[PDB]
Design a protein around this nucleic acid. Structure first.
Ligand SMILES: [Mg+2]
Ligand SMILES: [Mg+2]
Ligand SMILES: [Mg+2]
Ligand SMILES: [Mg+2]
Ligand SMILES: [Mg+2]
Ligand SMILES: [Mg+2]
Ligand SMILES: [Mg+2]
Ligand SMILES: [Mg+2]
Ligand SMILES: [Mg+2]
Ligand SMILES: [Mg+2]
Ligand SMILES: [Mg+2]
Ligand SMILES: [Mg+2]
Ligand SMILES: [Mg+2]
Ligand SMILES: [Mg+2]
Ligand SMILES: [Mg+2]
Ligand SMILES: [Mg+2]
Ligand SMILES: [Mg+2]
Ligand SMILES: [Mg+2]
Ligand SMILES: [Mg+2]
Ligand SMILES: [Mg+2]
Ligand SMILES: [Mg+2]
Ligand SMILES: [Zn+2]
Lengths: 249, 38, 119, 196, 160
RNA sequence: AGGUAAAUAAUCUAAAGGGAAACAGCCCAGAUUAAGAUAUAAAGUUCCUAAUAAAUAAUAAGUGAAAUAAAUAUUAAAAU
RNA sequence: AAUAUUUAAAAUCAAAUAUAUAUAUAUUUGUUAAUAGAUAAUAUACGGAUCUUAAUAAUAAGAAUUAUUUA
RNA sequence: AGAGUAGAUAUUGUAAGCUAUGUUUGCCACCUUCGACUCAACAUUUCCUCUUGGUUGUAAAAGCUAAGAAGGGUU
RNA sequence: AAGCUAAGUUGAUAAUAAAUAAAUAUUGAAUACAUAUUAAAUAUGAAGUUGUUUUAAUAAGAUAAUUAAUCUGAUAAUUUU
């Protein structure tokens, strides 16, 4: 009845011993990490306008981050995925735009075809929100601090003056044909090569930018927007993550 | 501490110790007599 | 000293064994030379080869260089020699007044058994 | 050797046992080694406490006169001989602790230099010239008590642990030479400098 | 004449277990022993032009022997190319990061011949800090060895 | 001084081969053409890399492991 | 145990070889170690890996360092 | 040696001794551009910042001297 | 006016934690004393180290769909985030 198999004595008679835990494991990394105790929500940077404090009279530039159909699609767990995170989805998209596979995924998770999806990593299993629920601006409290991730404005192929604040050469006094140049780019033969990471002209902007400890000036569920003190990376209609500030409480 | 190659005990109250692969001379009476071998 | 003559200051075990073997070979050669002379002298007197080989009283060599080589005070055998004189020459300009024999040029051919009494 | 040869006296209330460990560990030096197998215990009135010890060492319990001896398999082995004098001394200290108890008096010296039991004995608050509050938690086994504010007493079964704790307490402010001023553990002295 | 026949078994990649808890060799000597196996020098059919070396599964690698004070002294180096980026890690640190198996692998890599097959040979080495491993089922075994092993242990292994 | 000036010997010069990591001059040894069984030289024999097993001591410093760094200091060890 | 030198086979003793030979004479050989001192600029740099062993327990490892040797 | 109110070794340290460095001025002869601007990379023999030993010459405060330390900074 | 900009605006100098350096201790022999250990045990300790934080790269893993009247991409057009 049983299948034919041979087993080595060396592997059978080996005394059982558990492996020690390693730093470059997922679970150790998770333990190390500095993470927020609560989920976040995806937003769109609609624009920017003044916020007048009515008690003091102080004016503050505030960016208006709109919150539309923001929904916990699913979430990830340490036993399956190696970490705790809430996959949030923002907005509504047409059928036409969304891939068949993506549409099927959304149907399975029981949400509308979504405009932008993103994870929000958390410390514990307690931080996970039940899936399918709708996240509104009232999630955040007025006066609380939040970290803000988004892709910055694209600046194109930039020079070393704009990239790195290089002083450049003089305007007059003989200076020929190199007024905005980086000057020397190395050393005569000891290196015999431009060493890695030498600040040179290149593409700038259109990279991710976390902005830490920004104050939530105002929250209102009526207009579907979170007011946030100061600037946020990227153009108008750019997607903006928002989670509680790890540094500030 | 007088960090030096030569490390002799000065007074009777000085005592030599061998720690961390270095000869230390501590002293119970005079604190100036503290020495270390390199 | 920009050119690198990477010669170690001391010999390996295998080098030392080879040196010892070489020393032993020169002693053997000397022994053979004396033995053959003795045999020849026995033959001249009127013995057979076998009889000469058997002989109790072996004849010592009359020529000077051979006689000197036979003497251990002048030319010692490998078994007689000190550990130091097998592997270290006398070099007056070196510190310790000593230098590895392997540093001598053509040390594999050139013989040097006897060092000075206190150097 | 001269220490380890000295026999240990025991009173009927105290029992010095010995037995093998559950999982013996081996200390590996450069050339020599040292396998910790046995585990001596000193049970008594005030408490009980143990010493993990090498295989080469073993006791010799005598019924007559309450003596016990300690010996190693090779006294001419240097490491073993060194261990022998240590272990005997350790078990003597344990005996002393379980029967009598080890003590460590700290006297505070200075204007407004004093100790206080803050967490019902579980945290010795120490005020010794600092804006920030200073102190540390008492370990298990250690019992602290304060007859005066400026004179604290630490008490325990382990001579090692109590005196370590005392040293830690002192470390906040050791005695200064100019004014005999700080925290003095037991009979501690300091040569006071001339004022000038 | 000697070469003519069925050569498939000669060039067969066997799988060699080594329970490091049982093995009494030090790290470097063990690594050297492994290297030969990985190359295929042990087998007489070997030729330098052909990779014909076996798999080596190392297990219970946490109990590997290292002499002296090498565990807290011996430094493993690394360098990207950009100056001021020399990464020097002590053996214990490396172990903490990855394991004792990583350490063994490095030794084995250094032992191996420096050419296009080296990487392949290194890959064939399968090291494990503890006991449990997927290749348990594929170590070379014989029917005559089966009496030594108890009945239910074999079944448990098969299940695993 | 990898300096300079000559004395003696060798090699290079004009010398390929093995060793010395790599190497004009050091250690072996001189390519007429092959063959590859046997003796080998200097140098080697854990792996990279052709080839190894022992004995008695010492070191614990990775000292050292083919390019030996000094006076002096400390700690031992023998002998008187 | 303490004090103070020396680190030696010249003397001395022991061992071995050669001449008359159970002895004498002559010759040859045998007398410390570790650490610190220690040190610059592209990058660790014994050529590299790596090398100092461990009972339970292996048909099995235990310098791959230094010194004197053997097969 | 000698200064240091006294005490060579807190701090100082003649002349002579033993080394390291390859930062100066030379020597050799294998080998036939100073400064400014710009951007700097590396070292540590550390000037500042952090930790610490000594300081009859650390009462305090400023110091002096020494050990660790090249993360950040150094008109 | 938009845009772009700094003279402008907003934020950050990335914790907690772990093991350490010099240095400071505990018990304690070897060595009747002494000795923080170049012994066994037990503790403190730095703008440094490990990390943490941030960016870029990579893609283990995960959800879903699976020869298609509208599967997934590309070529094409109108464009700019
Ligand atoms: Mg300008
Ligand atoms: Mg112009
Ligand atoms: Mg010349
Ligand atoms: Mg010519
Ligand atoms: Mg040639
Ligand atoms: Mg010629
Ligand atoms: Mg010829
Ligand atoms: Mg070394
Ligand atoms: Mg070297
Ligand atoms: Mg003599
Ligand atoms: Mg270097
Ligand atoms: Mg080599
Ligand atoms: Mg004077
Ligand atoms: Mg002078
Ligand atoms: Mg002060
Ligand atoms: Mg320094
Ligand atoms: Mg850091
Ligand atoms: Mg600002
Ligand atoms: Mg004592
Ligand atoms: Mg003490
Ligand atoms: Mg810190
Ligand atoms: Zn003193």
């Amino acid at each position: 009845s049983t299948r034919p198999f041979l087993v080595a004595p060396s592997i059978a008679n080996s005394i059982t011993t558990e492996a020690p835990a390693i730093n470059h494991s997922p679970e150790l990394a998770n333990a190390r990490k500095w993470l927020p105790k609560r989920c976040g929500l995806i937003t769109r940077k609609k624009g920017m306008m003044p916020y007048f404090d009515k008690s003091t009279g102080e004016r503050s530039a505030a960016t208006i981050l709109e919150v539309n159909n923001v929904e916990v699609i699913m979430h990830r767990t340490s036993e399956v995925n190696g970490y705790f995170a809430c996959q949030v989805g923002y907005g509504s998209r047409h059928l036409s735009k969304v891939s068949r596979q993506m549409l099927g995924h959304f149907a399975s998770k029981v949400v509308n075809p979504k405009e932008h999806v993103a994870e929000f990593r958390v410390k514990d299993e307690k931080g996970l929100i039940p899936p399918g629920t709708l996240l509104k601006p009232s999630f955040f409290k007025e006066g609380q601090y939040v970290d803000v991730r988004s892709v910055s404005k694209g600046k194109g192929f930039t020079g070393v003056m704009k990239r790195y604040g290089f002083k450049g050469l003089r305007a007059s006094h003989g200076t020929s044909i190199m007024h905005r140049h980086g000057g020397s780019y190395g050393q005569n033969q000891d290196p015999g090569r431009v060493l890695p990471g030498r600040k040179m002209p290149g593409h700038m902007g259109n990279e991710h930018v976390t902005i830490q400890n920004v104050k939530v000036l105002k929250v209102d569920d009526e207009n579907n927007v979170i007011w946030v003190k100061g600037s946020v990376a990227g153009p108008k209609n750019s997607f903006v993550k928002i989670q509680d500030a790890i540094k500030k409480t | 501490f007088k960090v030096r190659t030569s490390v002799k005990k000065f007074c009777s109250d000085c005592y030599l110790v061998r720690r961390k692969g270095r000869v230390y001379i501590y002293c119970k009476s005079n604190k100036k007599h503290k020495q270390r071998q390199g | 000293g920009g050119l690198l003559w990477k010669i170690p200051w001391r010999m390996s075990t295998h080098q030392k064994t080879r040196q010892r073997e070489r020393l032993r070979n020169v002693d053997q050669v000397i022994k053979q030379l004396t033995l053959g002379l003795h045999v020849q002298r026995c033959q001249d007197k009127g013995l057979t080869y076998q009889e000469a080989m058997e002989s109790k009283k072996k004849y010592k060599p009359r020529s000077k260089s051979l006689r000197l080589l036979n003497k251990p005070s002048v030319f010692p055998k490998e078994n007689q020699m000190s550990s130091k004189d097998k592997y270290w020459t006398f070099d007056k300009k070196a510190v310790g007044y000593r230098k590895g024999i392997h540093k001598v040029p053509k040390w594999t051919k050139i013989s040097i058994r006897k060092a000075p009494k206190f150097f | 050797s001269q220490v380890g040869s000295l026999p240990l006296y025991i009173s009927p209330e105290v029992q010095v046992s010995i037995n093998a460990l559950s999982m013996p560990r081996i200390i590996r030096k450069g050339r020599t080694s040292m396998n910790i197998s046995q585990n001596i215990t000193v049970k008594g009135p005030k408490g009980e406490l143990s010493v993990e010890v090498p295989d080469f060492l073993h006791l010799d319990k005598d019924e007559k006169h309450g003596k016990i001896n300690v010996t190693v398999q090779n006294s001419e082995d240097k490491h073993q001989r060194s261990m022998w004098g240590t272990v005997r001394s350790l078990i003597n200290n344990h005996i002393i602790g379980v029967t009598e108890g080890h003590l460590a008096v700290l006297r505070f010296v200075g204007t407004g230099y004093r100790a206080q039991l803050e967490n019902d004995g579980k945290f010795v608050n120490v005020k010794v010239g600092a804006s920030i509050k200073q102190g540390l938690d008492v370990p298990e086994g250690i019992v602290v008590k304060t007859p005066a504010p400026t004179s604290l007493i630490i008490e325990g079964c382990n001579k090692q642990q109590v005196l370590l704790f005392a040293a830690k307490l002192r470390k906040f402010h050791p005695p200064e030479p100019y004014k005999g001023k700080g925290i003095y553990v037991n009979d501690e002295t300091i040569k006071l400098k001339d004022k000038k | 004449s000697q070469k003519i026949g069925h050569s498939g078994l000669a060039f067969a990649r066997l799988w060699h277990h080594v329970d490091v808890a049982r093995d009494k060799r030090t790290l470097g000597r063990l690594a050297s022993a492994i290297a030969i196996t990985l190359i295929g020098r042990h087998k007489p059919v070997y030729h330098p032009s052909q990779d014909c070396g076996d798999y080596v599964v190392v297990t219970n690698c946490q109990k590997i022997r290292v002499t002296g004070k090498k565990f807290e002294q011996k430094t493993y180096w690394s360098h990207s190319g950009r100056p001021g980026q020399l990464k020097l890690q002590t053996m214990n640190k490396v172990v903490a990061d990855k394991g004792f198996g990583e350490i063994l692998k490095k030794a084995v890599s250094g032992m191996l011949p420096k050419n296009k097959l080296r990487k392949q040979r290194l890959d064939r080495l399968k090291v494990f800090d503890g006991s449990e491993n997927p290749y348990k089922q594929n170590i070379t075994a014989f029917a005559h060895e089966q009496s030594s092993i108890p009945e239910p242990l074999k079944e448990s292994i098969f299940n695993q």
